[PDB]
């Protein structure tokens, strides 16, 4: 009684887009945190005595 | 004369089991009758999908 032509493949392709969007959003969030967390003011000491 | 000790293979030497003769089954499976009235055969019924 769905009356919808395909329903199920549409729901599947919607789920795929949801997962892809979250995958990209997580990467952007991690880049932002990596940028903001360690800025020479909070760390005060590099991970290895050489790098910046 | 005649036989007077005639051998029967249907009697057990011990008293544990009685007959030593398994009965057959040959189908004869009985079910509830429930005759088919089929009143709905008179009426028109076309299956519909959705709506």
Resolution (A): 3.9
Q: How far apart are CA B11 and CA B20, in angstroms?
A: 7
Instruction: Report the gap between the CA of A4 and the closest CA in chain B (Å).
Output: 8
**In chain A, which residue's Cα lies nearest the Cα of B50?**
A1
Say which DSSP state A6 is in: S
Closest by Cα among B38, B50, B23, B3 to A5: B50
DSSP string, B1-51: ---SS---TTS-SSSS-S--------------------GGGSS--------
Burial pattern A14-37, b for ≥16 Cβ within 10 A else e, equals: eeeeeeeeeeeeeeeeeeeeeeee
Whether residue A3 lies within 8 A of chain B, CB to CB, comes out as yes
Distances in Å between the Cα of A23 and the Cα atoms of A16, A37, A41 are 11, 21, 30
Instruction: Report the gap between the CA of A1 and the closest CA in chain B (Å).
Output: 4
Q: How far apart are CA A2 and CA B20, in angstroms?
A: 64
In 3-state terms chain A splits into helix, strand, coil percentages (rounded to 5) of 60, 0, 40
């Amino acid at each position: 009684q769905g009356d919808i032509d395909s329903l199920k493949p549409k729901i599947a392709v919607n789920q795929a887009k949801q997962l892809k969007r979250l995958e990209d959003e997580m990467v952007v969030q991690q880049l932002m945190l990596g940028g903001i967390s360690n800025t020479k003011a909070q760390r005060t000491n590099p991970r290895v005595p050489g790098h910046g | 004369s005649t036989p007077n000790v005639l051998t029967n293979v249907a009697v057990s030497h011990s008293g544990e089991v009685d007959s030593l003769l398994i009965e057959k089954f040959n189908g004869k499976v009985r079910e509830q009758y429930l005759k088919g009235e089929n009143l709905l055969s008179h009426f028109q019924v076309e299956t519909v999908t959705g709506t």
